Every structure is written in structure tokens, then in C-alpha cells.
Amino acid sequence: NRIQVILECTEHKTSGVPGTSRYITTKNKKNTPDRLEIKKFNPILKRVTVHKEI
Amino acid sequence: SKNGRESESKRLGVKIYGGQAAIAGNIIVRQRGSKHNPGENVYISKDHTLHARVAGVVKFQKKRDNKSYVSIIPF
RNA sequence: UAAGGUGGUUAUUGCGGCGGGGCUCACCUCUUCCCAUCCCGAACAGAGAAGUUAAGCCCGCUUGCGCAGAUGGUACUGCAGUUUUGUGGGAGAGUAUGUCGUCGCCUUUC
RNA sequence: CAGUGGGACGAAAAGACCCUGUGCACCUUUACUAUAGCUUAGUACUGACCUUGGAUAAAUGUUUAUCUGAGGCCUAACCUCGCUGCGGGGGACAGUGCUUGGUGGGUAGUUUGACUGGGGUGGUCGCCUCCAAAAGAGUAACGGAGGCUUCUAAAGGUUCCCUCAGUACGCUUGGUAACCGUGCGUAGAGUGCAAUGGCAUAAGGGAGCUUGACUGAGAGACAUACAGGUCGAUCAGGUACGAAAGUAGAGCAUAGUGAUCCGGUGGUUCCGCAUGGAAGGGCCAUCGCUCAAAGGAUAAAAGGUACGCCGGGGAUAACAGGCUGAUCUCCCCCAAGAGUUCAUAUCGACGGGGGGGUUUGGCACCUCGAUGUCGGCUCGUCACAUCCUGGGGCUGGAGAAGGUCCCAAGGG
RNA sequence: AAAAUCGUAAGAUGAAGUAUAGGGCCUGACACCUGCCCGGUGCUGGAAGGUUAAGAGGAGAUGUUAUCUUCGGAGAAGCAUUGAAUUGAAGCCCCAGUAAACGGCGGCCGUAACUAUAACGGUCCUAAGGUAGCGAAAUUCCUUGUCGGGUAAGUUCCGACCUG
RNA sequence: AUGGAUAAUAAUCGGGCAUAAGCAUAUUACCGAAGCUAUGGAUUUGCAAGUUUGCAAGUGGUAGGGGAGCAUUCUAACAG
RNA sequence: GAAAUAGCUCGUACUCCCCGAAAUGCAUUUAGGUGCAGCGUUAGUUAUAAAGUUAUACAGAGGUAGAGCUACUGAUUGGAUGCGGGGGCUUCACCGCCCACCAAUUCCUGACAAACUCCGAAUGCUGUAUAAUGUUCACUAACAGUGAGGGCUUGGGUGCUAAGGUCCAAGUCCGAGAGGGAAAGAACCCAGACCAUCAGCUAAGGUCCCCAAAUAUAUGCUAAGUUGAAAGAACGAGGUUUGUCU
RNA sequence: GCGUGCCUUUUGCAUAAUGAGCCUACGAGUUAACGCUGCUGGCAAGGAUAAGUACUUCAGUACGGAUCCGCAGCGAAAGCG
RNA sequence: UGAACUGAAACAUCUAAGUAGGCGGAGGAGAAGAAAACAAAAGUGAUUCCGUAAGUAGUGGCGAGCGAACGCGGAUUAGCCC
């Protein structure tokens, strides 16, 4: 049930800045469904941004 | 039979003793659970390992209902 | 001298029982406000000073429960030879016994 | 000198029985990978016309010029027969070449693990906890006990708080084992999951807010054949909680795992074969292996040999020898009884102490460049733990026949 | 122009034969007979339905750029890579047959006058639960089974029983 | 000290044999090895003199490692 | 082809001098082979040198031997209570009773444990300084062999507190080792072989002869040839010497 | 008086584990290419030539700098140094 | 036309190896030989052989292993016919 999720930054890919911020975490496909969203530090933009599960 | 399995030893025990010198990051005691508690200039890690904080001389000084409190006298 | 606050000391410092005390400590009266109960001003928080040592707290006594604990002997054991032993180390348990703490720094007091 | 053959583990054959070698050979199949042959379709040799269907192009549901799927017919390629080029039988079929799917031990190349108180059978192969382990660390057995191939978006972070299990006394259901009230209760609870250690001034439980389960990194140490593994303090950029100090780079800590190659996904003017792109590759993040025989020899793999062969082993078994008695046989010690009464004329349970090495075993110490194995025949020889003959004691011995014990190996 | 056999082929045997003939396989004179099972593996026939090769076919996508776009980017034609719909046989799945084709052919419980047994009844599972015949056997471990004969004495032998 | 059975080719303090030549304690002398020492000699390292000597420590040895050399056949020079 | 391959057996030729091991650990289609580590040789480095070895003084952590359990977990001998349940009589009423066993909790004693600990040594380990010995220590380079071990003493597991059995740990020896003693024995006791000598002193063990040295001294025991090599039982006995009580 | 041949394999052999009837002759770590260590030699921030060519009394001095190693490293790479 | 033993410490891709072997033809030599070639912003100009480049680029169950080319220095030098 425990799957591997990839939280990619959401405010990224909208500005003229090359790159993409991602976080490779684990989750449960039964206990926590519906595309978990978590605030993580974006190393490209140098600020905390909400990353949503792909 | 059904008894032929065992695991490798973790090489626990007591590192630098209570009369020897240590430095800023020397492991003092490796334990499974805090049976040697940290004192002055000595902290504990995630695995209940005792680390030194500054250079000095180790001192155990068991006290308070037979509980070892490892500390470091700076020098 | 007495009390309050705050620390060091592995309960010989603790638990219990019996008497004494209150400028400070504590109960004690209320919930408008600050604050809170998965229900309750019980606890926490605030506003006061009618009463009280009754209790908490502090003193004096108590071997009662706990805690500490010898000297001597014994077990065990390093080295040397051996059926024996000689040289050193030396417990645990138990007995006699001890303990109703001790050491600092601040404020009000005499 | 003539006769018999007990020994020289006598001579002969680098044991043919057993084990072994990532040795060989042959054979088998529902092991792997191929192939001869057989067979299906497409295509070339292979052509002319009618019927029936589909598609494209044009014009106003049909028509006209093509492609294709099928049938029928014709002879003119191609095949066959009879007379010596004809007269018949088929016919664009069959045969053949290339490309393909299925069968195919008919054939060929190979694989088929190790540990092991001989080898098979059974069991195990990686990781974690306790004992063995002899008070630093480490330390083996097919030694004694158990678990793992995970889980939590909260079972993570911070701030503020709370105290367990059990038991006694009371109370409708309710029963002293449900909830409640008052005492006693240093830990006997709980800490997801085995064990050990730890934890109440909590690592156990609750509430509020949150995502540090961040980015760039690693002073110094512990383990250490290597590959790997474990802990960790300062600094910078932005965060969560908290009034602030301060804490937070995942869980109370030890198990929850798989190297390399190859391939996939996201980011990246890093390179990109004359130049500019691209294919592709490189760097960072990450995915795919019960490779479980878990340091994984291939992407891909099972058996028989008494028809066997070669190279070695007493490193290792079967006969015999050797050490020890578990088993075997014999004796002795105590005596509850049985013997009409009376333990020991005779037997003797429940227990104990030894002698012998004749049985079945344990070990694997000499022999696998050979120590010929059961039974019977001939020839004997030795011990006495005596079957007869010989000499005695006791008797539940009237005599004769008995029972038991002692001495005795000359002959049978 | 047989099947089949040898060969790369041509060719040859079969056969200067032709179903009362020629191959493949089992059993083994003669007498009586030769039971049940098509589940599994082989063989034959069918082909409505599913899957399925090469070869045809080319919706769309990608690379390059004439040109247009202040930048970004879009991009006709040509040239190349990659290609999905559609068509596509045998075989396999499927349907039925075949055992003188390979192969297979069961248990428990209760019950009749003294005992014993069960003609009989209940129940579970199969494709079927082994018929006739024989039976201590070239097949039987217990075993030197049990009874009779042979011998003074018979682990061998003969004739019986049936717990094969 | 004594009784508590013994194994098969002829046996055992090693044998003769011993009443101590057995056992227990104490003492003295002696024997006893390639151990130690006395004499002679050779060799390896380290230290000095020189161009061999002196002193100190050594000198069992398998697998294995290092250093100095002998003989054999032939070749180049000088001398036979 | 071809001198196929052989992780296998066998063989491997002159001399002298110096040094000198291992039979262990981790992996392995691996176990009688290898790779790395451990142990060896040669050469070079640390100098106002460093490191080693033994002992002493000081200072540390431990949970073995031992001990104890009313200090937990499990087991456990004997007495005191017996709350309450099972069984006999009395009866309308497992109703009010009367009687003997298994019997909760508590107290007192006796005592067990590798996977029990309220306790807990000796030794061993680590660090500093000192005192003895001086490269024995450590580092680099090159080259190897070994990776079948075994006996004895001690602490253990398994086995039958059996094995010249087997698997570990702390030492020594053989392996690779001559000489002397036990009569002869790879390991037992003494002792580490540069040669030569018709020299002396000793170790273990012995002094009647074989066979070197005491028929030596003092005291007592044994009558069994016990014994003079090693090694024995439960259980008997009016053998003898000797101490105490009686 | 003392003294159980030799070799090989072995924890361990007089071993009754292997091998040899004896003598004479033959018989087993050699060479090439490419490297690494120890000693020695030339040159020295430089060192060395290969194939080849010329002369000559000819299987035996001069020339030949192509090229190789070292002098600067880090990074996958652009690149920096 | 064309193997296998062997190596990969097994083995099938691979190596061994286009080797051994078999068949046919020619000459003192044979083959090749005059660019539908290299190279890269600078250039060379037929083929053959020797030394470097170089154990480099690359290839490979990316395992065992296999392994060029460009450029440079030399021997020789020659171009023509449908």
C-alpha cells in the first residue's frame, strides 16, 4: 500500500527560471489519498513553496 | 534442528575511560539505551551514544541512585 | 533568633506516629475582567483581606517501617608443585551497630 | 636336499565397492537453446476473360478508369502419359527460390549448488535479539530459544500539561473482571510487530499550531580484508513552534534487505565527429531483479548409467584391527516379599557398584599405485565363564533321583 | 508419379508389384474367453467464436528549413526516422469421436437364533471403482501363513483355504 | 596393609632379585645432558683503528627470503 | 589441429654462511583452489627521536566465579491459619444447619536456575608517570609460503562428567627440534645442538648387579613380595601403629 | 658401548603408506616482446632515439628529433589554472 | 568452402579462427594500384612495405577479450588505354 510519491513545486515552472524542484517521499495509497500537498523549501527560488503530489 | 541463527555483534562497550583525554567529537560510550547519562560538556545522540563537546578529561562519577553521569573536565 | 526563596550532597537525607508556631507562607471569599475545564473557578488565571493554624509548611521527640553497616571467619581466585599445599587478593549472606540529616547564597527580622 | 604352505599386511593389475573433479562419454524426458524433416501464408516463375463483395479519384444512391478479397472458365507458360514431333490428362494449380507462424530428443551443444561426524534422505543458506562467551572488544558446532522482507502524513517537529498495571472499601443494571468516588500503589503498565537495554524531573498519554520527513555540507571518532556500515559538533540561505532562551537535517535504540551491467522518467547551450540543429552521450534526482543458493559465475537449463571411463583419496564409508561401553553378558551390595510359619534350601522386585570385550553401536586412528567378503571341508591350538567323567558344602537331602554353590582344563 | 526408406539433388528400393498387394506397431500354436473408464497424454474430424506470424496499408507524431514573426514562436514543399486503425493462414483455446492407442479401475459405519460374518441399508469422493479367471504364485514383507500327503525327522515339493 | 572372578600364542617391578634393595620425614657425599664453565679455532651484525685487528650480542631449523663461491663447454686479450 | 585441458598424482641435479613462519579471519558454483587481511625476508625511514616489552604507584568501566532470592521471573520442602467451592444425615426450601478431603490470601522455615539478580571478587583490559631491556615497535617498496594441524593443562558446549571423539577460548610443545630420564613412546619431566678436546660443575632422575654413582646415616611403619611403573569401586573384617574423648 | 636405510606425502612413517634389480649415457624454471623493484653508469630541466641514409678493410663511424617520458594540476565536460 | 579442443576458472553470445583441413589456377613473385579518396577552414594528391601514432578512439553476456584511423618520418616512384 505504501507508494513512492514525488512532490513537485507548484509555483515553479511559471516564471522564466530553468529547473524544477522535487521531493521524493513515501505515502500510503489507502490511508492518505488525494494528492498530498506539503510546504517545502524550493532551492531554486530560495523560498518555501507548496509542492503537490504528481 | 531449528536453532542455527544468530546476528553479528555490534561491538558495543565503553570507549575512552574516566581518566583519559578526549577531543571535540570523540565517542565516549556506545550503548543500547541511556544507561550512562550525559553530564557536563557531554551530549547524547540518537542511538544513545555519548559524545564529547570540548577537549578535556573524562569522569564518570556514579551518583543519584546508581546512575552514571559521564562528564568532561576541560583542560 | 525565626521565616521565605534558590542550589550542592547516591534515603545515615525517605515513610509513619506524637506535641508546638505564624510580620513574610498557606488555606480562606468572589468570578465583571485576562485565562480554562473533552462537565465542573476541582486545577489554571484574575480581583480581595471576614477568618484561621484546622491542613500544607517549619521545629522537638520516636528504632516503629525503611536505608547504611563493621571486626573476625568462610567461599572463590592469580603464581609455583602436586593426594597433600605455600604465598598474595578477598567476597556475598549474617551479627554487633548507626541514622529522625548536612553544607552555601539572598530578603524581612532578634 | 625332499615335502606343507602360517607370515614377509607375499607377486599381478596407479581398487572395478564409496567419496571426489564447477572431468569425460553415452542414453532419456514434460530441462535450456538451436536445427534436419513436415507443414501454413506472402512473394517470383504466373497468364487472358465472366460473376460476386470492399477502397480510392472525378462527375451529376449509380456511372466511368485502378487496387484488393473469392469463385468459374480458357490455353499459352509449367507438369505428366501413349506412339515416334503429334494424340491425350491436368493447368496458372503443383514443384522450386526468398521471408515467415506451428510442430519436431530424429539430431547437436550444454546445465543440473554447497554445508554435512562417509554420501544420499531430512534440515539450512540473507538480516535482527538473548545464552553458549570464561565481569574490555572479538570468539565455533546439523548447540539451546524466537522474529523480518514492514508500518506512521501522523506513531514526525515545537509549546503547555497529565500519570501508569493492580488492589481494598462503596454503588441500579453490573456479576469485583465494564464506568464512577476515596485510599494504597517507583513502575509489576505502556513504548505497532521477536528479545535485550532504557524511560515517571518520561522515551508513556492529551490539547494548540505546523511540515526540519529543508537546501549546500561534514570538525572528530567507533567498526573495520575490500565493498560497505554507525554516530556526529560548528557555518551559510530560508522556515515551524515558543514571550524568550531554545528545539527541530524523521520515528526510545538495535531487523524490514540486493553490488555491477542494461533500460525508463524529470531537470541541465556540459559534449555533440566540416559548420547549424538533431540522434546519442555525460552530470543530478529517481524507477525496474523472493538475482531467497540473498558478495548476485548466463537474458536463457532437468535426470540415469549394474555398459561405464579417466584423474586422486585411507583428507572419506563397507570387512578386519584400534580407543569407550550406550547396547550385550556375568558377578557383587541392601532386602519389600514369594517360599504352610522362615528374607538369603530356591527365587527375589524397587535401587546401587564393578569385571570381559564374544552382539548391535560411537569415533574415524594404519591400509583405496588392492589388508579377497558369508557358509561348509581338512588341520588344529588356546581360555575357563565346566556339558560328561573326578573331589566336596548346604538343602524345603528318609534311600534312589534332584536343586544350588565351591575346586578342577587330563581326555572326550 | 502409392505410402515408407537412402541422398544436397538426379536417382534407387518398394516393384518390372498394385489392396487376397505393400509399410508402422503389439500379441505369439490350439480350447474358452478378452469386463468398465475418453478425466490426463496421444490420434481423427469439425470450425460458428477468441488469440495469433511475415507481407500489404499509412490516422498521426518527430528532425531539418523557404518564409513570416520587435523577442518568444509558427512553419508550405522536399528529404529521413517512427508509426496506430484495416486485412492476414496454420496452430492453440473450443466441439465430438477413439482404449487389441499410452494409461487407470475407491473407503467408512450399522445390521440375521450361541459365537462369528454380513445377503442388506446409510454416507463421502471419482472417469470408473476392476468382471470372468487364478491366487501364499518366477508376484506374499509378517511367513518356516493354516489344514492334508509324502519322510523316523521336510524353511524345499504337491493339493486345499483367501487376510491378493 | 587385607577380601572383593577372570580371556583366550608364555609370562613380567624392564630382569636378577630384595623383608630392605618397600614406604614416610630429615641430612651429607657422589653419578648424571650437545645445559654452564675451562682451552683451541671459524663465522654474522654493531662500534673504532686502518686498509686485518680489538670489544659487545649472537651462530637448531621445514615452507620460504638474502649473501658469497666451485666445477663443466665455448669465446676475447696477455702469458704458457 | 596438438606440446587440447588437468583447481589432480609423481619428479625437480653443486657447496658454504645469515634470517625464518602458518595450518587463523572474511568472501567464493566455495570447502583438498583461490582473492584480501594475519604471521616471514631484504632494503630504506622517526634523532634535542619515536615506539615496543615486563613490573610498580595512581585512576577508570564491567556483572564471570561466588552468593542470594520475603529483591523480581520461573521452580520448590515442611508447619499455621481455610476466606470460599466439591461430598454424607435433617427436611416443603443447592433454605436455616452439623461434619472429613482437595483447598485463595498472609506469616515462618529449608533451598534451585546458561537464557533470575537487591549484591559481587581474583584476574584480565585501558591511560599517565616511574624503574629495568634497547629496535625487539611503527611506516614505505619488492618477494614469498601458509590458509588439512595435533598432544598436554585450564574454562566450557555436545556426547553416556565415554573415547587417542568433536567444536571454541587462555598458555606451552611437536609441527620445524637435536641431547638426558621414565625399558622401548612426535607432545610427559629436564633442557634450545658453531665446531674440536681421553677437562670440570650441575638440572630432571638416581647410587646392590645388568648399568655411572651410598649394600650411607637418623627415626617409625609394612608381613602383604603389598611394593620396587601407572591405575580401581559399592560393601565386609577381632591385621597392625598412633592422638583425643570415654 | 651406541645405533629400527633413503625419497615423497603427512598432525604424525622403521612402518606392514609410495617408489627404485644394478651400472653407464639422456632427463625437467629457458627464450622473445612489453613492464616493476635493488645495485651500478652517462647526461641532467632536460633525457633518448626508431625506421632509414652515407662512407668503409662490410652479419661489423657519422647522420637521422618522426616520436616517447618528465617539467602543473583540478573537473564527467565546457573550462579554469 | 571451413571445424573442434581451449579461454571465459561452469556455459549457450563471444574467443579459439577465417586458424587447422579440403578444392582450383597463375607467376617469380602474387594481390592491390591512379580517387564517385582523405582532411577541415589550413591543406595532401595512385598502390605496397617499415617505425611511431597506440594498446589511443572505440567495441564487448561492456565479461573473457578484440582493437583502428588521421597526421608524421622513410624504401621505391609511372602512368595510361576503351
CSV table of N, CA and C (backbone and C1' of nucleotides) in Angstrom, one decimal, chain E residues 7-30:
chain,number,residue,atom,x,y,z
E,7,G,P,20.6,-40.5,-45.8
E,7,G,O5',20.8,-40.0,-47.2
E,7,G,C5',22.1,-40.1,-47.9
E,7,G,C4',22.1,-39.3,-49.2
E,7,G,C3',21.6,-37.8,-49.1
E,7,G,O3',22.6,-36.9,-48.6
E,7,G,C1',20.6,-38.8,-50.9
E,8,U,P,22.2,-35.8,-47.6
E,8,U,O5',22.0,-34.5,-48.7
E,8,U,C5',21.1,-33.5,-48.4
E,8,U,C4',21.0,-32.5,-49.6
E,8,U,C3',20.2,-33.1,-50.8
E,8,U,O3',18.8,-32.9,-50.7
E,8,U,C1',22.2,-31.9,-51.5
E,9,A,P,17.8,-33.9,-51.2
E,9,A,O5',18.0,-33.9,-52.8
E,9,A,C5',17.1,-33.1,-53.6
E,9,A,C4',17.7,-32.8,-54.9
E,9,A,C3',17.5,-33.9,-56.0
E,9,A,O3',16.3,-33.5,-56.8
E,9,A,C1',19.8,-33.3,-55.9
E,10,A,P,15.4,-34.6,-57.5
E,10,A,O5',16.4,-35.2,-58.5
E,10,A,C5',16.4,-34.8,-59.9
E,10,A,C4',17.5,-35.5,-60.7
E,10,A,C3',17.3,-37.0,-60.9
E,10,A,O3',16.4,-37.3,-62.0
E,10,A,C1',19.5,-36.6,-60.1
E,11,G,P,15.3,-38.3,-61.8
E,11,G,O5',16.0,-39.6,-61.2
E,11,G,C5',16.9,-40.4,-62.0
E,11,G,C4',17.8,-41.2,-61.1
E,11,G,C3',17.2,-42.4,-60.5
E,11,G,O3',17.2,-43.5,-61.4
E,11,G,C1',18.4,-41.2,-58.8
E,12,A,P,15.9,-44.5,-61.3
E,12,A,O5',16.2,-45.5,-60.0
E,12,A,C5',17.3,-46.3,-60.0
E,12,A,C4',17.6,-46.9,-58.6
E,12,A,C3',16.4,-47.7,-58.0
E,12,A,O3',16.4,-49.0,-58.5
E,12,A,C1',17.3,-46.2,-56.4
E,13,U,P,15.0,-49.9,-58.5
E,13,U,O5',14.8,-50.3,-56.9
E,13,U,C5',15.7,-51.2,-56.3
E,13,U,C4',15.4,-51.3,-54.8
E,13,U,C3',14.0,-51.8,-54.5
E,13,U,O3',13.9,-53.2,-54.5
E,13,U,C1',14.5,-49.8,-53.2
E,14,G,P,12.7,-53.9,-55.1
E,14,G,O5',11.4,-53.4,-54.3
E,14,G,C5',11.2,-53.8,-53.0
E,14,G,C4',10.1,-52.9,-52.3
E,14,G,C3',8.8,-52.9,-52.9
E,14,G,O3',8.0,-54.1,-52.5
E,14,G,C1',9.4,-50.7,-52.5
E,15,A,P,7.1,-54.9,-53.6
E,15,A,O5',8.1,-55.1,-54.8
E,15,A,C5',7.8,-56.0,-55.9
E,15,A,C4',8.2,-55.4,-57.2
E,15,A,C3',9.7,-54.9,-57.3
E,15,A,O3',10.2,-55.1,-58.6
E,15,A,C1',8.2,-53.1,-57.8
E,16,A,P,11.0,-56.5,-59.0
E,16,A,O5',10.7,-56.7,-60.5
E,16,A,C5',9.3,-56.9,-61.0
E,16,A,C4',8.8,-55.7,-61.8
E,16,A,C3',7.6,-56.0,-62.7
E,16,A,O3',6.4,-55.9,-61.9
E,16,A,C1',9.3,-54.8,-63.9
E,17,G,P,5.0,-56.4,-62.6
E,17,G,O5',4.1,-56.7,-61.3
E,17,G,C5',4.4,-57.7,-60.3
E,17,G,C4',4.2,-57.2,-58.9
E,17,G,C3',2.8,-56.6,-58.6
E,17,G,O3',1.9,-57.6,-58.3
E,17,G,C1',4.5,-55.2,-57.8
E,18,U,P,0.4,-57.5,-59.0
E,18,U,O5',-0.2,-56.2,-58.3
E,18,U,C5',-0.5,-56.2,-56.9
E,18,U,C4',-0.9,-54.8,-56.5
E,18,U,C3',-2.3,-54.3,-56.9
E,18,U,O3',-3.3,-54.8,-56.1
E,18,U,C1',-0.6,-52.6,-57.2
E,19,A,P,-4.8,-54.6,-56.4
E,19,A,O5',-5.6,-54.8,-55.0
E,19,A,C5',-5.2,-55.9,-54.2
E,19,A,C4',-5.4,-55.6,-52.7
E,19,A,C3',-6.8,-55.4,-52.3
E,19,A,O3',-7.0,-55.9,-51.0
E,19,A,C1',-5.5,-53.5,-51.7
E,20,U,P,-8.0,-57.1,-50.7
E,20,U,O5',-7.1,-58.4,-50.8
E,20,U,C5',-6.0,-58.6,-49.9
E,20,U,C4',-5.4,-60.0,-50.1
E,20,U,C3',-4.6,-60.2,-51.4
E,20,U,O3',-3.5,-61.1,-51.1
E,20,U,C1',-6.4,-61.7,-51.4
E,21,A,P,-2.1,-60.7,-50.5
E,21,A,O5',-1.7,-59.4,-51.3
E,21,A,C5',-0.9,-59.6,-52.5
E,21,A,C4',-0.2,-58.3,-52.8
E,21,A,C3',0.7,-57.7,-51.8
E,21,A,O3',2.0,-58.3,-51.7
E,21,A,C1',-0.7,-56.0,-52.5
E,22,G,P,2.9,-58.4,-50.4
E,22,G,O5',3.3,-56.9,-50.1
E,22,G,C5',4.2,-56.3,-51.0
E,22,G,C4',4.3,-54.8,-50.7
E,22,G,C3',4.8,-54.4,-49.3
E,22,G,O3',6.2,-54.6,-49.2
E,22,G,C1',3.0,-53.1,-49.8
E,23,G,P,6.9,-54.7,-47.7
E,23,G,O5',6.7,-53.2,-47.1
E,23,G,C5',6.8,-53.0,-45.7
E,23,G,C4',6.5,-51.6,-45.4
E,23,G,C3',6.4,-51.2,-43.9
E,23,G,O3',7.7,-51.0,-43.3
E,23,G,C1',4.5,-50.4,-44.9
E,24,G,P,8.1,-51.5,-41.9
E,24,G,O5',7.2,-50.7,-40.9
E,24,G,C5',7.4,-49.3,-40.7
E,24,G,C4',6.5,-48.8,-39.5
E,24,G,C3',6.4,-49.7,-38.3
E,24,G,O3',7.5,-49.6,-37.5
E,24,G,C1',4.3,-49.0,-38.9
E,25,C,P,7.9,-50.8,-36.5
E,25,C,O5',6.7,-50.9,-35.5
E,25,C,C5',6.5,-50.0,-34.4
E,25,C,C4',5.3,-50.3,-33.6
E,25,C,C3',5.2,-51.7,-33.0
E,25,C,O3',6.0,-51.9,-31.8
E,25,C,C1',3.2,-51.2,-34.0
E,26,C,P,6.4,-53.4,-31.4
E,26,C,O5',5.1,-54.0,-30.7
E,26,C,C5',4.6,-53.4,-29.5
E,26,C,C4',3.3,-54.0,-29.1
E,26,C,C3',3.3,-55.5,-28.8
E,26,C,O3',3.7,-55.8,-27.4
E,26,C,C1',1.5,-55.0,-30.2
E,27,U,P,4.4,-57.2,-27.1
E,27,U,O5',3.2,-58.3,-27.4
E,27,U,C5',2.2,-58.6,-26.4
E,27,U,C4',1.2,-59.6,-26.9
E,27,U,C3',1.7,-61.0,-27.1
E,27,U,O3',1.7,-61.8,-25.9
E,27,U,C1',0.5,-60.3,-29.0
E,28,G,P,2.7,-63.0,-25.8
E,28,G,O5',2.4,-64.0,-27.0
E,28,G,C5',1.2,-64.8,-27.0
E,28,G,C4',1.0,-65.4,-28.3
E,28,G,C3',1.7,-66.8,-28.5
E,28,G,O3',1.0,-67.6,-29.4
E,28,G,C1',2.5,-65.2,-30.1
E,29,A,P,0.2,-68.9,-28.7
E,29,A,O5',-0.7,-69.4,-29.9
E,29,A,C5',-0.3,-69.1,-31.3
E,29,A,C4',-0.2,-70.4,-32.1
E,29,A,C3',-1.5,-71.2,-32.4
E,29,A,O3',-2.3,-70.6,-33.4
E,29,A,C1',0.2,-72.7,-31.9
E,30,C,P,-3.9,-70.5,-33.2
E,30,C,O5',-4.3,-71.9,-32.5
E,30,C,C5',-4.6,-73.1,-33.2
E,30,C,C4',-5.1,-74.2,-32.3
E,30,C,C3',-6.3,-73.8,-31.4
E,30,C,O3',-7.5,-74.0,-32.1
E,30,C,C1',-4.6,-74.8,-30.0
